């Protein structure tokens, strides 16, 4: 009924690693165009939105829509039992009671074969229109993770300020305060800033340190900011889709 095949299955393992700790359980909408998932976290302060297109799998075929409710920790557990270069295959049929996972080694002596209990959820899907953002900045993902981790040692909230020259992250706590400033450059190590007008926003840092679990999915991260609207941290998944985290600002 539904049967997808993914040759580089490190992708699917990394996607689960980047979601299991922010969101316990979400709904996976499978269709002919691809996989689509949207979920808030328990506090309703952040939201994650995953998009994996059928074009990116090696063989994709889904005869009709299907709303698999999955426990993402239990999916992550199963996913860990696959090697990083295993060829994963997903299988499910009409109203799926279970989802099937097949890990094949590429030396061809080993074939693992798991089957995951699905669950019942009713999701609160939200309307995310298109929009252009006052500032978008494209930097290395390892850097943005390094910065969000270090600044939490100082204070528990970050002030991101983007303007015509560079971007500034700042924090302040009982022990002191700090600023980190990056400027444009002259592939994977390049900072670039699409500036339409200056921005200065404040976000809780603990959520950002969940978002950074997506760092293995891409060399690059792009932040998108405008006044009075959620920040968008997005990691592209190569030739296939993207992962985007929405983080509401502070009041």
């Amino acid at each position: 009924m539904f049967e997808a095949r993914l040759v580089q299955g490190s992708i699917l393992k990394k996607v689960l690693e980047a979601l299991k700790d922010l969101i316990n359980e979400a709904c996976w909408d499978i269709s002919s165009s691809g996989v689509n998932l949207q979920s808030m976290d328990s506090s309703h302060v952040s939201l994650v939105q995953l998009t994996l297109r059928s074009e990116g799998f090696d063989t994709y075929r889904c005869d009709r829509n299907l709303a698999m409710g999955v426990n993402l920790t239990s999916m992550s557990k199963i996913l860990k039992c696959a090697g990083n270069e295993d060829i994963i295959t997903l299988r499910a049929e009409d109203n799926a009671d279970t989802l099937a996972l097949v890990f094949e080694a590429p030396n061809q002596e080993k074939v693992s074969d798991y089957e995951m209990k699905l669950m019942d959820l009713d999701v609160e899907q939200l309307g995310i229109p298109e929009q252009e953002y006052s500032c978008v900045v494209k930097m290395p993902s390892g850097e943005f993770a390094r910065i969000c981790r270090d600044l939490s040692h100082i204070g528990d909230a970050v002030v991101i300020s983007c303007a015509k020259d560079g971007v500034k992250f700042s924090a302040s706590g009982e022990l002191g305060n700090g600023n980190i400033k990056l400027s444009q450059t002259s592939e994977e190590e390049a900072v670039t800033i699409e500036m339409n007008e200056p921005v200065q926003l404040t976000f809780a840092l603990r959520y950002l340190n969940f978002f950074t679990k997506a760092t293995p999915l891409s060399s690059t991260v792009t932040l998108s900011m405008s006044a009075d609207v959620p920040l968008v941290v997005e990691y592209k998944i190569a030739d296939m889709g993207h992962l985007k985290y929405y983080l509401a600002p502070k009041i």
Binding site: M40, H44, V45, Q125, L126, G127, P230, A248, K250, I251
Partner: peptide, 14 residues
């Protein structure tokens, strides 16, 4: 002081 993300995106129905 954390705003909820439901304060920027509306629920779509059934």
């Amino acid at each position: 002081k954390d705003s909820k993300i439901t304060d920027h995106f509306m629920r779509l129905p059934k």
